[PDB]
Amino acid sequence: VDREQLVQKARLAEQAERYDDMAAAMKNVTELNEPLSNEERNLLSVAYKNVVGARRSSWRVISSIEQKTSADGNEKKIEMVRAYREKIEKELEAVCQDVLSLLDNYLIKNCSETQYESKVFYLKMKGDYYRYLAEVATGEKRATVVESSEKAYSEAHEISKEHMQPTHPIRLGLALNYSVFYYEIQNAPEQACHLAKTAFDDAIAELDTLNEDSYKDSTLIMQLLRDNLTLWT
């Protein structure tokens, strides 16, 4: 099967809302050891974001019932909810370590050191899926995936501050998720607000650098930064 056919199947799987097949198709494209275009980069991201997103929503629903059923005391019913919450947990973790495998072995590796837009994209993507692992992890297992998530984000933030425009959608989106990581995972609203506000201030200071094409995506992320700021302060 040709590479163009795999990308066509991914676009076809997207319209048919079959996001599991879309991820398998874009994984096959990734495994060709060739770099991904800006379109194929978003196709892979959209696919796995929907696959892991479906199991993120299921876990939060079951985990909430698990904390709600703990007052029942029925050991036969509590162990059944605990086992189900664990099964969705394993599926969520397998998807994450699948994306991290593609990122470390193929995507970030085959990234030319001169292409900073893709390196920041993949490093942010790497920090996203380690954050999804920390959403369901406890104890030292959580401390490990939190440390890995901070490392991928911090490495992406330093590259974006030196070779990318403050109004670039990828640098803006990275600071949005990074600030969310400090708020939802580390519970640091002061650190979350300082990062979200700084990226908002840097973009405003260089608002003339808004690209004639990507300004629509840049302004939406800037709105999301102030929406989180007003929500956290």
Partner: peptide, 6 residues
């Protein structure tokens, strides 16, 4: 509330 990028 999952205030991340969509």
């Amino acid at each position: 509330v999952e205030h991340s990028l969509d």
